[PDB]
């Protein structure tokens, strides 16, 4: 399957992998322009289970890893820099495990390397919501999105909240077979021992106020990676890269500037 | 099994409300938040207060327990119920401890009947809703008015996330303990619980609170997202004799989650009032 992708700029290639429910478009409001200004070529794409493949099911982390590898291959950009968030960070982790030759260095945001209890509770709650067929009313769905994704400081800022609520109407997340299958694309076992063999330089970024993927789980991944290090962004929830894009972009661009392509 | 007569409601009905009265010392009336029965004060607050020689009055707010089917009442109805409890026991002016909706009722009681309240601790409170909190209120109303019922695991996760500190949420053993506790303190979706959602600021009440003379301790919980601690600070700032204290590593249920820190602060405050 060809996945839709957007290819911008010329220069050292960086492949962005969005998290569950995110199209490649997720990276364009805040990341791509900054990376273009710094002279990178940016590739974004629609993960399996999004957009044209929203009715796909029965796929696994390995399928998504293969999809990503195929993208890097087909564009002739091996090895590429990789930026991944949540599910996207997991896919990047797992890609570095099987095909380290395709990745020169990586940033992994809001990530984890085992099936921790927070993930278990999330899995169960989401799968249940899906299987029940219940539709959350719109304002209640938006309140849940606000609470799960943003820091305290943002929720206190009246103008910001008005924007994020507007932002939700411009960013609808349809409940699809694809979205449900993506829920399964997460650690099912302790992958930390496997990450101990990843040689690439890696920056793990944890977001301070993250309740979906608490920052301490990112520390575990950075600790396991021989050349990994951990950075924490304050006052950032799970959508830290959208919320504090200046802090997050500075961290990634400083890291990527320090390492060879 | 004690009961007192509540105020007449806007539909001209008079109902009775259950209360509990323990101890012989200085009277303290506890006012629980939305969904909370009087028994919510008994695991952590009542034993400490009794040991300090206070008498503890707790009760079931209109819309809870025996009155869970009550509807059509307002903030003013609940203020008058609380006044009636104080007047019935002849304990005016009484010390008051309120949390969240209970703190709002205590504030509004002090505005209209200051002679009934000598001093108060107001936990997890506000004098207006900000944008986020107005929206959260609209969302809850919508869920209820929609008839849609949350699946039980989803519901449990939301309850945990909304009420506890990051320090609790990161502690797998503590999370298990609270989750089991939820099973023992179900929050039934009732007409009373829905009507309590509108017992909240509909306008900015901060200007009104500048006329409250009584000494007040406002306690904010640092990780509270339901009633963020800056909104508590605004109440303390409005009150000419109010002061603010913040408890670290405490979510919306801070008085239950960090009971020692909360109880210590309240008892230090009450020992020095007026
Ligand atoms: Na490391
Ligand atoms: Na003050």
UniProtKB/Swiss-Prot annotation, chain B:
Keywords associated with the record: Oxidoreductase, Peroxidase
SUPFAM superfamilies: alpha/beta-Hydrolases
UniProt binding sites for substrate: 34, 100-101, 133, 252
Membrane-spanning segments: none
Quaternary structure, from the entry: Homodimer.
Active-site residue numbers: 100, 224, 252
Gene: bpoC
Family statement: Belongs to the AB hydrolase superfamily.
Organism for this UniProt entry: Mycobacterium tuberculosis (strain CDC 1551 / Oshkosh)
Xref: InterPro entries: AB_hydrolase, AB_hydrolase_1, AB_hydrolase_fold, Epox_hydrolase-like
The name this protein goes by in its record: Putative non-heme bromoperoxidase BpoC
Molecular function via GO: bromide peroxidase activity
Pfam families the UniProt entry points to: Abhydrolase_1
Statement: the UniProt record of this protein carries the keyword Cell cycle: no
């Amino acid at each position: 399957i060809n996945l839709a992708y957007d290819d911008n700029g010329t220069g050292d290639p960086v492949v962005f992998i969005a998290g569950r429910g995110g199209a490649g478009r997720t990276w364009h409001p805040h990341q791509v322009p900054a990376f273009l200004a710094a002279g990178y070529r940016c590739i974004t794409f629609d993960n399996r289970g999004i957009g044209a493949t929203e009715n796909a099911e029965g796929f696994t982390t390995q399928t998504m890893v293969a999809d990503t590898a195929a993208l890097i291959e087909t564009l002739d950009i091996a090895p590429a820099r990789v930026v991944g968030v949540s599910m996207g960070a997991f896919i990047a982790q797992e890609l570095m495990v099987v095909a380290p030759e395709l990745v020169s260095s990586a940033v992994l945001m809001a990530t984890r390397g085992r099936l921790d209890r927070a993930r278990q509770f999330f899995n169960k709650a989401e799968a249940e919501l899906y299987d029940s067929g219940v539709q959350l009313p719109p304002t209640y769905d938006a309140r849940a999105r606000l609470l799960e994704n943003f820091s305290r400081k943002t929720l206190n800022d009246d103008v910001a909240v008005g924007d994020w609520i507007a932002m939700f109407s411009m960013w609808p997340i349809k409940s699809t077979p694809g979205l449900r299958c993506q829920l399964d694309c997460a650690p099912q076992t302790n992958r930390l021992p496997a990450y101990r063999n990843i040689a690439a330089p890696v920056l793990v970024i944890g977001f301070a106020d993250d309740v979906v993927t608490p920052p301490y789980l990112g520390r575990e991944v950075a600790d396991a990676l021989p050349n990994g290090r951990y950075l924490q962004i304050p006052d950032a929830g799970h959508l830290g890269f959208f919320e504090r894009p200046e802090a997050v972009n500075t961290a990634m661009l400083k890291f990527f500037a320090s390492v060879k392509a």
